[PDB]
């Protein structure tokens, strides 16, 4: 997930990016390549919840993008699905 390669030829497969660095504020950039598979077979996040029976899944959800990726779709779908 934290993959940023300096070799500049294996760059198109790098995962972490740096958008803009205006002093104190850094703008990182994570790819949702396999995290939220919209029209694909099966996702990373689905195996984190539906398939993995390992104890470490509580720590494994506490990685950097997924703590904010789950807050994305909660803010868009939580208030709507509750009111229905």
């Amino acid at each position: 997930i934290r993959l940023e390669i300096k070799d500049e030829e294996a760059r198109h497969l790098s995962r972490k990016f740096r958008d803009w660095a205006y002093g104190p504020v850094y703008s990182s950039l994570y790819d949702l390549s396999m995290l939220d598979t919209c029209g694909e077979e099966v996702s990373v996040l689905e195996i984190l919840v539906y398939n993995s029976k390992v104890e470490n899944r509580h720590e494994m959800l506490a990685v950097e993008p997924i703590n904010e990726l789950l807050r994305d779709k909660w803010q868009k779908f939580g208030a709507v699905s509750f009111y229905i």
């Binding site: 205006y22 002093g23 504020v25």
Partner: protein, 157 residues
């Protein structure tokens, strides 16, 4: 070349030998550096503002040269003091950018040629997080240099 797209590139390239002969080229076609077209129609980003974005180790030799070309046309208080014309990055000048990337040599160059100290970067980006912006500093270059952990510009201002 003679167009704007060649000129906005080579400044980011930072090759002053590829910018030769443009000063009497403006003598021929009577054009100012910030007349209508050598400035972004969406934002207002000029050649000097583009020069401070892309840097070569924090050094671009076009920066005294763009002031030199502006001196012959007579826009030293205009080519330096032209803020952004957009809404999101509204009011940001080249003085805000040079303080931002800690070019202490180039901060001294702007004011000596004539720079507005009290230019306010009052854009929607420069608002606090409750208002929709990402970074707040009180819209002032003196306050900006204090927010960038740099007292060296603070002594200079």
């Amino acid at each position: 070349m003679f167009n704007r797209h060649m000129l906005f590139d080579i400044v980011s390239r930072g090759s002053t030998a590829e910018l030769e002969g443009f000063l009497p080229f403006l003598l021929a076609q009577k054009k100012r550096l910030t007349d209508e077209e050598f400035r972004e129609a969406s934002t207002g980003k000029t050649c000097l503002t583009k020069a401070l974005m892309n840097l070569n180790g924090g050094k671009n030799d076009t920066i005294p040269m763009l002031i030199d070309i502006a001196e012959k046309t007579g826009n030293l208080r205009e080519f330096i003091n032209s803020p952004f014309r957009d809404v999101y990055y509204r009011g940001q000048t080249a003085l805000h950018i040079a303080i931002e990337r800690r070019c202490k040599h180039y901060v001294e160059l702007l004011v000596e040629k004539g720079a507005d100290v009290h230019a306010q970067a009052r854009g929607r980006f420069f608002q606090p997080k409750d208002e929709g912006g990402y970074f707040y500093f009180g819209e002032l270059p003196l306050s900006l240099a204090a927010c960038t952990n740099q007292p060296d510009i603070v002594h200079y201002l």
